[PDB]
């Protein structure tokens with residue numbers, strides 16, 4: 398047996414061959430991304446004389462349809478005048494090639510997870526974390542513009558890439574798992590480590606879940622490690638609880654999956670259901686960040702911009718993003734006005 402006249406493997410993926418040239422225009426260099434959607438290759442565009450990243454979607458309706466949605470969102474975004482739009486990876490064009498939908502993007506650099514790996518998971522300085530945070534908030538502010546109302550829904554280190562390995566500018570990629578505010582067609586969403594409490598609880602979600610993800614991400618960028626690394630959903634909620642405490646009863650009283658993690662005592666209050674975890678709220682963010690001890694592992698003692706004052710501004714902003722209540726979790730516009738960003 399052979400697939401798609403020999404162009405595809407048995408998993409609907411296009412068999413990538415280095416040096417092959419398509420439509421007398423693109424010269425495929427190499428594979429730079431794999432996914433359930435298909436692949437992402439680096440390629441040289443002979444016509445525009447530039448490197449581009451091409452996302453080759455699997456030759457399968459399920460995937461083709463999911464990608465057409467990403468194309469519409471991207472086209473919808475790029476057609477918006479503001480310069481906040483230069484925080485979203487740019488879709489140059491798309492076309493069908495050998496039965497595969499292809500999205501041509503501008504070529505980017507390393508993703509923030511690779512960045513953390515190049516530090517041996519020790520983290521980057523607070524000053525660079527600040528630059529990333531500022532851009533991320535602007536991007537979220539952008540996605541929040543009414544006509545868009547886009548919920549990225551899968552923010553994580555891997556989906557944030559450096560524009561150039563030298564500069565600190567970033568762009569968010571992968572809008573294949575995205576969606577606009579609406580009905581809840583699906584519930585299991587976001588990468589586990591960055592999954593917001595509302596999602597874990599089975600409650601209605603909106604753009605606020607991206608902000609939760611961002612808060613988890615900023616802490617990871619600076620300490621080098623995932624703030625909440627659950628092996629499964631129960632383990633995940635417990636780790637969130639160690640740091641933030643038991644969620645407010647008003648939220649847990651409406652949480653369809655509340656009893657998956659908590660139990661309501663005869664007096665109406667909620668407790669963890671169950672030395673695996675520190676007591677609720679005892680794993681203080683103040684200490685994870687090392688606010689008064691020279692940062693994570695004290696490896697920042699003495700660095701410019703790593704004063705107790707600087708760290709206090711960073712802790713406050715993170716705590717406003719990790720607000721259990723999505724109604725009062727800080728929004729993009731205000732996060733941007735936070736003193737962590739003031740000069």
Ligand SMILES: CCN1/C(=C/C(C)=O)Sc2ccc(O)cc21
Pocket residue numbers: 429430431432437450452486502503504505506570571572573
């Ligand atoms: C994995 C890398 N990656 C993308 C992944 C997805 C899922 O869309 S998209 C994209 C665009 C430019 C680039 O340089 C890398 C890149």
